[PDB]
Amino acid sequence: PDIPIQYELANNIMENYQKGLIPKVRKGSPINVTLSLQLYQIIQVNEPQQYLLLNAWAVERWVDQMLGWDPSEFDNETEIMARHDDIWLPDTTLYNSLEMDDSASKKLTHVKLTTLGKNQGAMVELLYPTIYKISCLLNLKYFPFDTQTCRMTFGSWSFDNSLID
Amino acid sequence: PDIPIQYELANNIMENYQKGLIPKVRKGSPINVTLSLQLYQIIQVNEPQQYLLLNAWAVERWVDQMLGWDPSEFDNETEIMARHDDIWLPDTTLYNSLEMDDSASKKLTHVKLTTLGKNQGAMVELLYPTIYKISCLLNLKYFPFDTQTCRMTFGSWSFDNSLID
Ligand SMILES: *[C@@H]1O[C@H](CO)[C@@H](O[C@@H]2O[C@H](CO)[C@@H](O)[C@H](O)[C@H]2NC(C)=O)[C@H](O)[C@H]1NC(C)=O
Ligand SMILES: *[C@@H]1O[C@H](CO)[C@@H](O[C@@H]2O[C@H](CO)[C@@H](O)[C@H](O)[C@H]2NC(C)=O)[C@H](O)[C@H]1NC(C)=O
Numbered sequence A, B: 001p002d003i004p005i006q007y008e009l010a011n012n013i014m015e016n017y018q019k020g021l022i023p024k025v026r027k028g029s030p031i032n033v034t035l036s037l038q039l040y041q042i043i044q045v046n047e048p049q050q051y052l053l054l055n056a057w058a059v060e061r062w063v064d065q066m067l068g069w070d071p072s073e074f075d076n077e078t079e080i081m082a083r084h085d086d087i088w089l090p091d092t093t094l095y096n097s098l099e100m101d102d103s104a105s106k107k108l109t110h111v112k113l114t115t116l117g118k119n120q121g122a123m124v125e126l127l128y129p130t131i132y133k134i135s136c137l138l139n140l141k142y143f144p145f146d147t148q149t150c151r152m153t154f155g156s157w158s159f160d161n162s163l164i165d
C-alpha cells in the first residue's frame, strides 16, 4: 500500500537481531574489519604536551552475518541505510588517544547495509569523520629542521584476534 | 471532547511512521533539501589554528512523503509543530568542521510540518542556530591588509546523490 518497502525490509531484517552481541553465526572464524583512513587536516602539532590533533575520514567495512535478506522478496532492493544505534558496531579504538569522550572525536550517524544473500549476511559500511588527539613522541634534536613520525595504533580493546580481525 | 485536534493529528500521521528510515515512498527520485544560511556574527578568526568561528542561522526544508494528512479531516488545520527527535532529519554535515560534538554547534529543538495532501507528504521546515568551527586556509601575505576567503562545504556524510539532493 502506502508503506515504503524499506520499512518492511528494516522490520524484517531487524526482527530477531540483537545489537548487544557479536553477529557471528559461523563458529570458527573471526569478523574481518577493514579500516581505511583519509587525512584531511593537521589541526595542531602540540610539542609541549606530546599530542597531535588530526582530522581524519574513517571508513569501516565488515560483514554482519545476521542482517541478510533476499533482494527479490523486498522489491529488488539491495541496499538500505540504517543508524549506528540499531546495529552492532566493532569497538575500534585508537590506543594512544588522549581523549576518552567519543562524542568529541567521532560523528557516527548512519550505516549502509548491502546484502550478500539471505543467510550470507550483509556488508556494513561505516563512514564517519574523526578528530584524533594522538600521543606521539617528538624528537626535537634538529629543531627547527626536524621531521617527526606519528603512530596511530588501532584495534579492539576487548575483542581479541579470535573475535575481531 | 477536551482533547485538542493537534493531539489527534500527531497521533494519526505518526502512527506507522519510522524515523530511522528515509521517508521516500516514491522510488526513482532523491529527497531535495533546501539549505538557507544567514550570517549573524563572526566570533573569532583564529589565525594560529586556521579556524573561523561563525554564528549562523540555518533553515532546512524538504518534503516528508509519509507525514501527510488531509486538513479537512482534522478540523481544517494546515500546520503542526513537532520535535526534531520524532521525525527523520537529513544528516547535513559541515565537511570542514573542527567540532564533532553536535550539541556544541547546533540547537535542534523543533520542526514545522505543513501538509501538501494526504498521500503527497508534508513540507518540513527546520530552523536552528549554529556555531561553526570552520577549517579555512589563511593567506597572510598582505598582513595586515589581507583579505581571506572561507569555504563552507555542506552535504550528507552517508547519503549520496541518489538519496538526498
Ligand atoms: C575473513 O578473513 C579470512 C582470512 O583469514 C577468510 O578466510 C579465507 O576463506 C576463504 C574461503 O572463503 C579461503 O579460500 C581462504 O584461504 C581463507 N583465508 C585464509 C588465510 O585461510 C574469511 O573468509 C574472511 N571472512 C569471514 C571469516 O567471514
Ligand atoms: C526534486 O527535484 C527534482 C529536480 O531534479 C524535481 O524533478 C522535477 O519534477 C517536475 C515534476 O514535478 C518536472 O517538471 C521537472 O522537469 C523535474 N526536474 C528535472 C530537473 O527533471 C522533483 O520534482 C523534486 N521533488 C521531489 C523529487 O520530490
Ligand SMILES: *[C@@H]1O[C@H](CO)[C@@H](O)[C@H](O)[C@H]1NC(C)=O
Binding pocket: A075, A076
Ligand atoms: C527489479 O525488480 C523488479 C520488480 O521487483 C523487476 O521487474 C526487475 O526485473 C528487477 N530487475 C532485475 C535486473 O531483475
Ligand SMILES: *[C@@H]1O[C@H](CO)[C@@H](O)[C@H](O)[C@H]1NC(C)=O
Binding pocket: B075, B076
Ligand atoms: C476551516 O474549517 C472550519 C471548521 O472545519 C470551517 O468552519 C472553515 O470554514 C474552514 N475554512 C475554510 C476556508 O474552508
